[PDB]
Amino acid sequence: NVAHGLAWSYYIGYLRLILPELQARIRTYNQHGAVSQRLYILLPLDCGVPDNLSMADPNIRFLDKLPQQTGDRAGIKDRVYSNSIYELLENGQRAGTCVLEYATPLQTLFAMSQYSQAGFSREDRLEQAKLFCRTLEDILADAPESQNNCRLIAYQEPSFSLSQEVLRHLRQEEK
């Protein structure tokens, strides 16, 4: 169960740090369209994570970054936590604006399957992704750092539109 340790590292190293500061960082960008106050984490179950999000879906477009976050982590002075704001389109229209990013450890799982001494078979990527998502979902439930600031988007492709999948979660929070 590699995913278990990566899920915790994902919370302890990243979400536990950025989420409490997240809501303050978003409304700082607005004052300086409208951006949603939740962090949207894409969780593809096939464990493939493009680097450029715009090449995952043409309807997902990059707009601008957030004001960064600084902190001293394990001796590194002012380690930089940055996030990107993406606009999702429908039929050439702007259907919403939010901070959107993949879950990096999914990409790392994909990499581990290729390396020989990782001892991780490529057939287990799908099951480890399911464990990663389920484990993380258990974290954010009891996570004091996370209260209505985060939504995990998990999907398994069978042609697929990722923009519509995100917009679905987006329009449900509008209710």
Ligand X SMILES: Nc1ncnc2c1ncn2[C@@H]1C[C@@H]2CO[P@@](=O)(S)O[C@H]3[C@@H](F)[C@H](n4cnc5c(N)ncnc54)O[C@@H]3CO[P@@](=O)(S)O[C@H]2[C@H]1F
Residues that bind its own copies (CB under 8 A): 2-6, 8-9, 12-13, 42, 49-53, 56, 62, 65, 68, 71-80, 82-84, 86, 100-108, 111-112, 115, 117-119, 138-139, 142
Can you tell me the distance from the alpha carbon of 43 to that of 62, in angstroms, rounded to the nearest whole number? Answer: 19
Side-chain half-sphere of 2: how many Cα atoms within 13 Å? 20
Can you tell me the distance from the alpha carbon of 42 to that of 54, in angstroms, rounded to the nearest whole number? Answer: 14
User: What are phi and psi for residue 39, nearest 5 degrees?
Assistant: -90, 125
Which residues have CB under 8 Å from 131's CB, separation 6+? 1, 3, 4, 7
Nearer to its own copies, 72 or 123 (CB): 72
Instruction: Please give the size of the binding site for ligand X, defined by CB under 6 A.
Output: 11
Task: Verify binding: residue 113, ligand X, rule CB under 6 A.
Answer: no
Task: List Cα–Cα distances, 90 to 18, 94, 120, 144, 164, in angstroms.
Answer: 30, 7, 39, 35, 8
Interface segment toward ligand X; rule CB under 6 A; list 36-44, 100-108, 117-125, 164-172: 100-108
Interface segment toward ligand X; rule CB under 6 A; list 10-18, 51-59, 116-124, 156-164: 10-18
- Smallest gap, in angstroms, from Cβ of residue 138 to its own copies? 7
- Smallest gap, in angstroms, from Cβ of residue 34 to ligand X? 24
- Smallest gap, in angstroms, from Cβ of residue 8 to its own copies? 5
Can you tell me the distance from the alpha carbon of 157 to that of 44, in angstroms, rounded to the nearest whole number? Answer: 8
Give the residues lining the site for ligand X (CB under 6 A). 9-10, 12-14, 76, 79, 81, 104-105, 108
